[PDB]
Amino acid sequence: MDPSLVLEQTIQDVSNLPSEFRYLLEEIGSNDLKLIEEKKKYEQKESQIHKFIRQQGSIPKHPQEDGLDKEIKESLLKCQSLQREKCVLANTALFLIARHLNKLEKNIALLEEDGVLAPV
Amino acid sequence: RKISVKQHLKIYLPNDLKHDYIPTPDASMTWNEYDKFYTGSFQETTSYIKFSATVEDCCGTNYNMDERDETFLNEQVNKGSSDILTEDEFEILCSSFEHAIHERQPFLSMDPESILSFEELKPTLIKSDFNLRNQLNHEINSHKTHFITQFDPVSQMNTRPLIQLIEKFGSKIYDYWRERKIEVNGYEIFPQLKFERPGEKEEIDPYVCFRRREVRHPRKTRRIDILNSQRLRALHQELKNAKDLALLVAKRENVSLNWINDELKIFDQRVKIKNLKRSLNISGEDDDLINHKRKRP
Amino acid sequence: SMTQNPHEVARVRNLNRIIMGKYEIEPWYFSPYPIELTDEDFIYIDDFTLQYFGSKKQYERYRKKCTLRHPPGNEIYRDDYVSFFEIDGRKQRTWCRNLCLLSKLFLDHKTLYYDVDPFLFYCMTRRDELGHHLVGYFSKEKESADGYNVACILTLPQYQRMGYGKLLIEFSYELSKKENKVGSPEKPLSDLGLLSYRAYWSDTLITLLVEHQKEITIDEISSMTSMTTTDILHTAKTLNILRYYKGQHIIFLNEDILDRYNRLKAKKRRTIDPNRLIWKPPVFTASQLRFAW
Amino acid sequence: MTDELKSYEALKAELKKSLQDRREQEDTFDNLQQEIYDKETEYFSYSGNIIKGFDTFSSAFNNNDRIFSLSSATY
Numbered sequence A: 001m002d003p004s005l006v007l008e009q010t011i012q013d014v015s016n017l018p019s020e021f022r023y024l025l026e027e028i029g030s031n032d033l034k035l036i037e038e039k040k041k042y043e044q045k046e047s048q049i050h051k052f053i054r055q056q057g058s059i060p061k062h063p064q065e066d067g068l069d070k071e072i073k074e075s076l077l078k079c080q081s082l083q084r085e086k087c088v089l090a091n092t093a094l095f096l097i098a099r100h101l102n103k104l105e106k107n108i109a110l111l112e113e114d115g116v117l118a119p120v
Numbered sequence B: 001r002k003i004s005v006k007q008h009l010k011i012y013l014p015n016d017l018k019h020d021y022i023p024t025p026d027a028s029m030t031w032n033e034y035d036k037f038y039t040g041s042f043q044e045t046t047s048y049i050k051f052s053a054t055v056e057d058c059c060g061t062n063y064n065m066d067e068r069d070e071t072f073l074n075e076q077v078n079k080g081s082s083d084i085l086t087e088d089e090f091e092i093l094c095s096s097f098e099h100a101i102h103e104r105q106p107f108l109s110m111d112p113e114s115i116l117s118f119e120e121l122k123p124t125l126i127k128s129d130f131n132l133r134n135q136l137n138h139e140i141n142s143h144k145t146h147f148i149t150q151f152d153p154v155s156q157m158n159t160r161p162l163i164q165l166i167e168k169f170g171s172k173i174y175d176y177w178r179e180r181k182i183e184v185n186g187y188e189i190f191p192q193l194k195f196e197r198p199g200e201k202e203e204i205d206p207y208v209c210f211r212r213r214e215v216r217h218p219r220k221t222r223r224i225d226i227l228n229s230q231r232l233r234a235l236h237q238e239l240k241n242a243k244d245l246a247l248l249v250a251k252r253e254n255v256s257l258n259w260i261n262d263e264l265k266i267f268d269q270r271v272k273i274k275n276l277k278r279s280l281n282i283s284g285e286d287d288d289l290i291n292h293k294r295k296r297p
Numbered sequence C: 001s002m003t004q005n006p007h008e009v010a011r012v013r014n015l016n017r018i019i020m021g022k023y024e025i026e027p028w029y030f031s032p033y034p035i036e037l038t039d040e041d042f043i044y045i046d047d048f049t050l051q052y053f054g055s056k057k058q059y060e061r062y063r064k065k066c067t068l069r070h071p072p073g074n075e076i077y078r079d080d081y082v083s084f085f086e087i088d089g090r091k092q093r094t095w096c097r098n099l100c101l102l103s104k105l106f107l108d109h110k111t112l113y114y115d116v117d118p119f120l121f122y123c124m125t126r127r128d129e130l131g132h133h134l135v136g137y138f139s140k141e142k143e144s145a146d147g148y149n150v151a152c153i154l155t156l157p158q159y160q161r162m163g164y165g166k167l168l169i170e171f172s173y174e175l176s177k178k179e180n181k182v183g184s185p186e187k188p189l190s191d192l193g194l195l196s197y198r199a200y201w202s203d204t205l206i207t208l209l210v211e212h213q214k215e216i217t218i219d220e221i222s223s224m225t226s227m228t229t230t231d232i233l234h235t236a237k238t239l240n241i242l243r244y245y246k247g248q249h250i251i252f253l254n255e256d257i258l259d260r261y262n263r264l265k266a267k268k269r270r271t272i273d274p275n276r277l278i279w280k281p282p283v284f285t286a287s288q289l290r291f292a293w
Numbered sequence D: 001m002t003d004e005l006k007s008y009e010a011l012k013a014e015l016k017k018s019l020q021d022r023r024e025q026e027d028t029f030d031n032l033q034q035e036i037y038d039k040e041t042e043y044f045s046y047s048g049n050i051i052k053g054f055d056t057f058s059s060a061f062n063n064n065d066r067i068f069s070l071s072s073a074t075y
Helices: A003-013 A017-056 A065-113 B067-077 B087-104 B118-127 B130-139 B154-158 B162-183 B226-280 C056-065 C093-104 C164-179 C191-212 C218-225 C229-238 C255-266 D002-043
Strands: B016-018 B022-024 C018-020 C023-025 C043-045 C074-078 C083-088 C119-127 C132-141 C148-150 C153-155 C242-244 C249-251
Touching (some): A003 B226, A017 A065, A017 B226, B067 B087, B067 B162, B226 D002, C191 C229, C218 C229
Antiparallel strands (some): C074 C083, C083 C119, C132 C153
16 A cells, blocks of 8 residues: 555546547537527427417417427427437436445545545 | 479468468458347547546446356246346446455455355445536436446436345345356456466466566655655645535536526426316416526626 | 366357447457456357447447447547547556557457557547447557568458558558658568558659659658668569669569559558648657656 | 216326326426535535546536536536
8 A cells, every 4th residue: 555656546547537528518519500500490490389379369369379389399309309418418427427436435434434635 | 384283382361361471360250149249339539538437337347147157047936036137237236245245255266165155245246437427416316216426327227226136136146146156166267367476477478468577665664654645635635626616516406407407397387287278168367478687607 | 356266167269249338340360368268159249349248248348338439539530431549558458458458459460468558549430420440450569669660450350352451551661751761561570561551652752753753762762651672673574664774773663563664653541641640759768768667 | 888987087187187197297397406506516615526636646517517417408
């Protein structure tokens, strides 16, 4: 048990992590642009139904209600798929740093069970 | 020249030559089942790949069913059972059996016949990165289903957890796994690489690979390494601030997923109410069928 | 695990036939795969993790669970033809071992005595709908004192005769130029590799000498190509560039040489584009230049 | 046919609740990004980060280095 050995080991294990976080986060932001543009593609089509309801109500049917609903539902699920990908990306970044943190914390615990590790 | 016969021998080339002469591998035939084994898609990203996970991180379960494991699953455990045992689930049990025996009976080969019984092992099977995956799922406040990363195939989601697989199938599978360990005399069931034991040096055996002869010795002092412990503590802090932000981002996308899962549900509810409203001729009732405008920075 | 049978029979056998990915290859030399595998009809090599299998059933179960689809490391070069991944043997122990076991089947002088810790593995891949497919690699000592910019180099047999070996060599010298270091392949080269290196040496030399116009010196050639003066002078002797005519040394670019120069210029050989190399040389400290503990 | 009227009473209440859930999600989302932005400032302004790198034992924090905030198109 050696603090300089655990430090050397932890440094190498997290060396490419800052590069990985950029690669992951910028892949999230690239999908948030894709998500936002797909939001307009249904927030507009959602505005068509609501304007018709704001004036006439729900009992009257919009001229193309069946047509827009299929286009809204299609555009919404595409946004769902795009959001899930952002979660997966964000979770791996969390998973990576959390796992290294847990390994380091186990080493710090073992260094403290011997006399080798100084207090904070 | 041509047609001078003084033993002109022809050679066909199952072993090629290229132009000293140079031997050349012949063209490689293709494999028929390739399309059955290699199924999926890898999307190229705009920027160059950054990656540092190991093969172990990307393989899932340690155990892999062989042909004999396959016949035993179909023709014994799943022959006419009301409850069927998934291949992925069969490996989850065996993967836990191997890990348990490796920890409790590391010197099994000394006395293979005395391998632990299933009842003797069941306590240790219970205590058996599942914990970290669940801890993260709570910290994200997802609290739904499984924690999904890039290292997870979607087919592992339909697999039962280990603690219940012990009760349903544990005794039947372990008795079969136990016999395999007995046949191999407590050694490893499947082919392993041949490694040199630490502190020993082997030179004759051709199958010994990847020797590691370096050795680190402790410093001749009992003093505390103040310097390398401050910097270890400093790095531990920066990894904690690291995890705090990564957690927030994973929280942010999780609520962003709940929000859209709501929108997709609110939509499917508004259209069902409208189709229901027109069948009953009920008027008014449009407050919750249209989006209103509130404050958002 | 120290779990090894002492009464296990150790007999040297080459593998009958390997199936790496979609292609069926025949090994040329011995490689210390597990002894049980050495007596099997077919050996299955995963095309992403390089994992070895004797049971087709396990290979099936492995693929269904394996999520990796490219060399476990950073992408440091990508054009529309190939990609290059940089892999540390100390970080990717299992993978680099699987690569070395695989490589040893087709390299006669490659050694597996020590572990893969001291090496950097530069792997050339061909991207696909399934992912990046390894076609060849070259290993490199982390900090070679001998100035070797390539330890072992190999193009996998099922991707032979497609210009890959010339891309490996070119990339190896591209790294040397970015490193501001001169380099030479490790001395024992296979017959196939020595041919490929002499082609690269003669091609890049005639191209440099013709377009140079101005008087050049041996040391300046080395600075532009990261070739050693020894490799340069030997290539000048393989050609007849170097003449001593009337009391002085001169460089002679005859017509037969300029014919190959023009054939080279018209041909559309695949080349390495230095601007698509996004890569800073690894910096190792004294503790990192050791075996892991 | 009263079952069809009860389905209407059930779906309305379910839509009462999902709208309330949507607002809560919208509301917690706005807090997180500010928290993300604030934590970027508290932590990044031995000197190792995920922004710069960890191996310091041998330039400033521009708003272009707020990689966590810049992962949301809303910011």
